[PDB]
Each structure stands twice: as structure tokens, then as C-alpha cells.
Write a protein that binds this ligand. Structure first.
Ligand SMILES: CC[C@@H]1/C=C(\C)C[C@H](C)C[C@H](O)[C@H]2O[C@@](O)(C(=O)C(=O)N3CCCC[C@H]3C(=O)O[C@H](/C(C)=C/[C@@H]3CC[C@@H](O)[C@H](OC)C3)[C@H](C)[C@@H](O)CC1=O)[C@H](C)C[C@@H]2OC
Ligand SMILES: [Cl-]
Ligand SMILES: [Cl-]
Ligand code: NA
Length: 108
């Protein structure tokens, strides 16, 4: 599948992201073996995005939509739902499944 969502800690079970809302998260991105390539936690600066604008990889678009506020989850994202056969220069190999540890902090 494009994205698999595995819950580390549950959310509120009620408030799921909608278009027009700003999602505020912490994340760590890694390959399937846990090798880290990026993190907002390390910047002590949360990351913000919105649905419906093609502004995040599709695995986030579909994965974070399945999370409720407060949830921490592992999103396992297939290459086609991430950087595909290309990868990301300097960072992500071709054909890489990505794992993001995401905490959905709030909706703004
Ligand atoms: C203009 C520079 C502008 C950069 C900004 C705002 C700095 C960010 C804080 C960090 C960078 O985005 C950094 O994050 C990563 O380390 C990372 O962990 C990651 O994969 N993401 C970050 C968290 C959310 C999921 C995912 C994502 O979707 O990021 C978006 C991304 C790169 C979407 C593309 C858009 C084109 C489209 O063709 C492509 O489809 C395949 C998807 C990003 C927030 C953009 O919306 C904004 C930017 O690129 C990748 C490995 C390398 C990245 O550097 C470039
Ligand atoms: Cl935003
Ligand atoms: Cl925006
Ligand atoms: Na943008």
C-alpha cells in the first residue's frame, strides 16, 4: 500500500485533519532500517502543512489524514507515495520506502 499507519500513542479519536486546516507536527524521517535523514524535533521547530495542495508527499497526505490530534504514529510510505524511482538528491536513494515517526500536535 501507499501508506501504512501504525500507532505509537493514540490520538483523541475524534479530530482528524480536514482541508483548510493547518496541521502542526513533529517528525523524524528514516529509511526502513531506521537510518535517519531528517527531523523537525532536532530543529525544535514544528513543521506545518495543509491537505489538498500537493505540498507534501502523498504518503503524508493520506497517512496524516488517518491520524487524530495528539496521535503519534509510524507512517510507512511506498516509493511511489514518496520520491519514487528517483529518490531525493543528497538524501534518499532510488526506490526507497520511507518511515516517518509523526506526532500530530494540533490543527490551526
Ligand atoms: C521549497 C523548499 C521547501 C522546503 C521546506 C519547507 C523545508 C522542510 C521543513 C524540509 C524539506 O521539505 C526536506 O524534507 C525532507 O527532509 C523530508 O523529511 C520530507 O520528505 N518531507 C518533509 C516533511 C513532510 C513530508 C516531506 C515533504 O513532503 O516535504 C515537502 C516536499 C519536499 C514535497 C515535494 C514537492 C514537489 C513534489 O513533486 C514532490 O513529490 C514527489 C514532493 C516540502 C515540505 C515542500 O512542501 C516545501 C519545500 O520543498 C526531504 C527528504 C528533503 C526536503 O528538502 C527539500
Ligand atoms: Cl502550511
Ligand atoms: Cl500552504
Ligand atoms: Na508550500
Amino acid at each position: 500500500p501507499g501508506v501504512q499507519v501504525e500507532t505509537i500513542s493514540p490520538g483523541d479519536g475524534r479530530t482528524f485533519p480536514k482541508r483548510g486546516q493547518t496541521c502542526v507536527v513533529h517528525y523524524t524521517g528514516m529509511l526502513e532500517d531506521g537510518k535517519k535523514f531528517d527531523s523537525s524535533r532536532d530543529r525544535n521547530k514544528p513543521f506545518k502543512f495543509m491537505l489538498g495542495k500537493q505540498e507534501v508527499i502523498r504518503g503524508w497526505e493520506e497517512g496524516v489524514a488517518q491520524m487524530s490530534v495528539g496521535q503519534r504514529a509510524k507512517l510507512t510510505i511506498s516509493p511511489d507515495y514518496a520520491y519514487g524511482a528517483t529518490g531525493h538528491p543528497g538524501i534518499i536513494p532510488p526506490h526507497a520506502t520511507l518511515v516517518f515517526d509523526v506526532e500530530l500536535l494540533k490543527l490551526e
